[PDB]
Write a protein that binds this ligand. Structure first.
Ligand SMILES: Nc1ncnc2c1ncn2[C@@H]1O[C@H](COP(=O)(O)OP(=O)(O)O)[C@@H](O)[C@H]1O
Ligand SMILES: Nc1ncnc2c1ncn2[C@@H]1O[C@H](COP(=O)(O)OP(=O)(O)O)[C@@H](O)[C@H]1O
Ligand SMILES: [Mg+2]
Ligand SMILES: [Mg+2]
Lengths: 160, 74, 371, 118, 371
């Protein structure tokens, strides 16, 4: 999603200075050979300002998900995006509204549970303990089984 | 809401949009060109109005979900 | 298309499409302008909250009913109430739906004519018809005879009907109703220390009346019992705490119906105006009216009224006749159910006041053949 | 119940939703294109007296004006729906802005960083 | 352009551009002329040090606040303070910036009119607007209802608001505030031997009060505990050494808020004027005010006040209502944050008192529609 655009916009002025200065300060080498392939934590330490942890965790996991374990120029941009606020910031709430509109193209007065059933079916994600639990919990945010608009509205928001 | 006024605005627009055409002030082929111009302009108008109906349907979506939320608040 | 069965009433507006069992939207008929100044900017504060919205913001409003006693005293507010009812509680434009209003008997003509003029000019309905509030309540019971006592919130009227032929000379309309009982309850609560004055606190007193008051089977015995024991004192929690205890105010508030001398009214109670309305009828249909006495309207929902009224009438009536009081559980919406039934009839489909007819004869068409 | 599983699940379903939104958008695009195509009423432009030409284009003008009038009325209707949407938006924003109204502001400028100059 | 959100206050002037999170420059509002003779020539000695400069040379000055209790008693000094605030702490000429002053409720008119006349004639601003100090503190909490107790340093006032409609008949303004607590602390410190008299040493007593004093959850138990053990005696180092030990003076200084009889004031504490302010409101909005009690102002920063106040109100209030006390961590600057939010609104952009309007109606424009 917004990941590639955030990487592209990293070509800027404030984050360019941030990346260059970070490299000049605490990316130098001349170690004992421990291979700081995990210098992500070192950079988090040497930042002087830690951003919200979601950036850190998404970078820790999703980067080199194949197990590359290495940070490139583009991955330097990824880490620096993690440093500044290059986030999509919850995407567009217009997109959330449009999605919920497509959900109630049947116009159930709310996104029905079977909307979620078919959407998970399309996504094909394995039905774990998280699956079905999340759907019922969002629908039964009243804990009464009635799915309302604001329930899934806040369920989907805050995410990119 | 005072339909005489709103219909009056509509009539003002239409008479304004009554771009009546003259006789020896256009060419036969030029008249064809103007006809196609109206054709395409109204086609775009129809597309915009269809999207307008779509967004109105989405407005009705918001109306029903909103009033249902309101009832749930009681 | 379907017809809109609106029922203005006085205290609760009940509306819904013809052919159902219950009204779709029921909400108090009050329009309350804010009275304080207001300091928050951009809060989106409107100039008048109508319907059920003004029963939640009633702490800073001055609610005022637009219908006093059947008649309508404030036409702008009534127009606002109708506009709300059509557009927000039913969401059906009136340009495509016939309407069936209801009106109390013996009301001023100008009220009815203005009602039809509004419905035809402002809302621009296809056709509207005005019906007497008691004939509908007789429809809902599935009868065709009987004398119906429709004790609403504005006005109590008692229309006798036989074999479908209404008796216009025997209608006894009395202006004591639920609102006067609310005021009298609010006035006798002051004997314990609780003072309700604001027009918003009238709603609290109304809730007390609905939830606690009941009609005593025998008044003197209850007055004696409540003055010795304490088995009657029921408590109730105000909207902020400070529970209150109602003693013998419980059955003294609705007793005003059978003794209108309590609020200074001269006339006789609802137990004796029914007997008088019967005795004005012919001598050969009195047995049927005795056997088919019908109750309707909201105020006849007090627990224990269908027995007190029967006891009183049996005391008044000759000993041989059988006195039976029909009190269906769906009393409150009886008028509207009857209205739905009447609007759903095929034989009635040509009685509407069509718009072209109004254009030819003016608003005075309602008094003409299309009644 | 694991946070990682929840993140994976919501991410996958949200991307499915985004893809279906793009599909809905392009399907609407095709609908509108076909709609305009079938709206067109072609005319036999040739072999007519030029006075017939002017008359025919005038008929087109009348139909065009009436069509734009219908679009006007529906635009007004959706505008009223917009006003109602604004009212309901005011309602919900009232209920939630009682707690989150001033959230619109400009923060984090100079006090946070410029500190040792004084 | 951007608006200047100034906030005169009494004790700390807080200012900054609209749309930020915190005031740009916060400094005490004191103007102190030197009092000794002065023998060094050419030292560049000024005739009056204002703001934070006079808190460093306070050893040879006579500091005097220009604002006594909300009202302004010395207009020349206040003009000097404003001039300093605009030119040296923000460095923005006022000719190109709207201003949003703040004023306590129930203040004399002449104070407000003189304030607007100064802002329009001397500093020559484009447009200025005066707002009540409690509505802003309600803005900052993101609420729209609630009763806010803004216990500043000059005056403590308690403005209840519902749904954006302020209730002008329920404002309870009390003149006990931080300054009287400083004087009372300075008066009870003499019971151990420490005498502070000079107007410069009032600042030292203020620092003692800020750093050591706390509000006791239960007063008698604390008085008994401090009189037996010695676990409370906290020491503090004066600006020259000679540490002092504060015993049960710690929780006796801020206790004056809940028992104003200590400093001889008749009125009831801040725990009971809030309940009285609520009870003057209508009967239907008391639950919401109970649930959304807001604290603001500097003096409400004592450690342990949000529990003492809740305990007291729960004792006074009916047992069913839920009592909740909102105490945001950014209490001190709550009024200014709210002021920034209000000045940043688009709907508010046409409420400013434009200069041409002042030229047409004189300084009395402030009491008019542009409030
Ligand atoms: N359950 C109840 N018990 C006692 N009184 C009631 C009850 N419900 C309604 N009422 C009284 O009846 C009134 C409503 O009467 P209603 O039939 O709605 O009048 P209208 O004929 O105008 O519709 C209320 O004002 C209330 O005082
Ligand atoms: N952390 C604190 N603890 C206790 N009291 C404080 C604290 N900070 C400020 N005060 C008191 O509050 C006063 C400042 O109040 P303030 O809110 O600045 O008044 P104003 O409303 O005039 O701005 C100071 O005089 C001080 O006595
Ligand atoms: Mg009725
Ligand atoms: Mg203050």
């Amino acid at each position: 999603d917004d990941i590639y655009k955030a990487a592209v916009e990293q070509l800027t002025e404030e984050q360019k200075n941030e990346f260059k200065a970070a490299f000049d300060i605490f990316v130098l080498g001349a170690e004992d050979g421990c291979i700081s392939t995990k210098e992500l934590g070192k950079v988090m330490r040497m930042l002087g300002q830690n951003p919200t942890p979601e950036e850190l965790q998404e970078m820790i996991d999703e980067v080199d998900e194949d197990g590359s374990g290495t940070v490139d120029f583009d991955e330097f941009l990824v880490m620096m995006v993690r440093c500044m606020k290059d986030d999509s910031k919850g995407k567009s709430e217009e997109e959330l509204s449009d999605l919920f509109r497509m959900f109630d193209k049947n116009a159930d007065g709310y996104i029905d549970l079977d909307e979620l059933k078919m959407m998970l079916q399309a996504t094909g994600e394995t039905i774990t303990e998280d699956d079905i639990e999340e759907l019922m919990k969002d629908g039964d945010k009243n804990n009464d089984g009635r799915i309302d608009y604001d329930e899934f509205l806040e369920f989907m928001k805050g995410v990119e | 809401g005072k339909r005489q006024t709103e219909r009056e605005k509509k009539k003002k627009i239409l008479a304004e949009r009554r771009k009546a055409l003259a006789i020896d002030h256009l060419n036969e082929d030029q008249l064809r060109e103007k006809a196609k111009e109206l054709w395409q302009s109204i086609h775009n108008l129809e597309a915009e109005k269809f999207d307008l109906q779509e967004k109105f349907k989405q407005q009705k979506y918001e109306i029903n979900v909103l009033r249902n939320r309101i009832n749930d608040n009681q | 298309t379907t017809a809109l069965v609106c029922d203005n009433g006085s205290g609760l507006v009940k509306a819904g499409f013809a052919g159902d069992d219950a009204p779709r939207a029921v909400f108090p008929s009050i329009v309350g302008r804010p009275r304080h100044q207001g300091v928050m900017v951009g809060m989106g504060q409107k100039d008048s909250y109508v319907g059920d919205e003004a029963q939640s913001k009633r702490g800073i409003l001055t609610l005022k009913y637009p219908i006093e006693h059947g008649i309508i005293t404030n036409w702008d507010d009534m127009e606002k109430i109708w506009h709300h009812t059509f557009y927000n509680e039913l969401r059906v434009a009136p340009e495509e739906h016939p309407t069936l209003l209801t009106e109390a008997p013996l009301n001023p003509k100008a009220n009815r004519e203005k009602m039809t003029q509004i419905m035809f000019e402002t809302f621009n309905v296809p056709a509207m018809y005005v019906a007497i509030q008691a004939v509908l309540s007789l429809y809902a019971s599935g009868r065709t005879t009987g004398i119906v006592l429709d004790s609403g919130d504005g006005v109590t009227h008692n229309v006798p009907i036989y074999e479908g032929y209404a008796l216009p000379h025997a209608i006894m309309r009395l202006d004591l109703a639920g609102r006067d009982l609310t005021d009298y309850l609010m006035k006798i609560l002051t004997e314990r220390g609780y003072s309700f004055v604001t027009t918003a606190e009238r709603e609290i007193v109304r809730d007390i009346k609905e939830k606690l008051c009941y009609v005593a089977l025998d008044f003197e015995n209850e007055m004696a019992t409540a003055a010795s024991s304490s088995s009657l004192e029921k408590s109730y929690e105000l909207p902020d705490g400070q529970v209150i205890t109602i003693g013998n105010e419980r059955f003294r508030c609705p007793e005003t119906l059978f003794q209108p001398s309590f609020i200074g009214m001269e006339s006789a109670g609802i137990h004796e105006t029914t007997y008088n309305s019967i005795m004005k009828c012919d001598i050969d249909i009195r047995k049927d009216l005795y056997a088919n006495n019908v109750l309707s309207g909201g105020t006849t929902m007090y627990p224990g009224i269908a027995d007190r009224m029967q006891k009183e009438i049996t005391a008044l009536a000759p000993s041989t006749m059988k006195i039976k009081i029909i009190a269906p559980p769906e009393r409150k919406y009886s008028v509207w159910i009857g209205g739905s039934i009447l609007a759903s009839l095929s034989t009635f489909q040509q009685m509407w006041i069509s718009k072209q007819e109004y254009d030819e004869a003016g608003p005075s068409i309602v008094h003409r053949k299309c009644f | 119940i694991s946070a990682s599983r929840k993140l994976q699940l919501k991410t996958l379903m949200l991307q499915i939703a985004k893809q279906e939104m793009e599909r809905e958008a392009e399907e609407r695009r095709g609908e509108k294109g076909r709609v305009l195509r079938t709206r067109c009423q072609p005319l036999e432009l040739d072999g007519l007296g030029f006075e017939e030409l002017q008359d025919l284009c005038r008929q087109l003008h009348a139909r065009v004006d009436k069509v734009d009038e219908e679009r006007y009325d529906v635009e007004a209707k959706v505008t009223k729906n917009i006003t109602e949407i604004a009212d309901l938006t005011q309602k919900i924003y009232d209920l939630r802005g009682k707690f989150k109204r001033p959230t619109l502001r400009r923060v984090r400028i100079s006090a946070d960083a410029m500190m040792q100059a004084l």
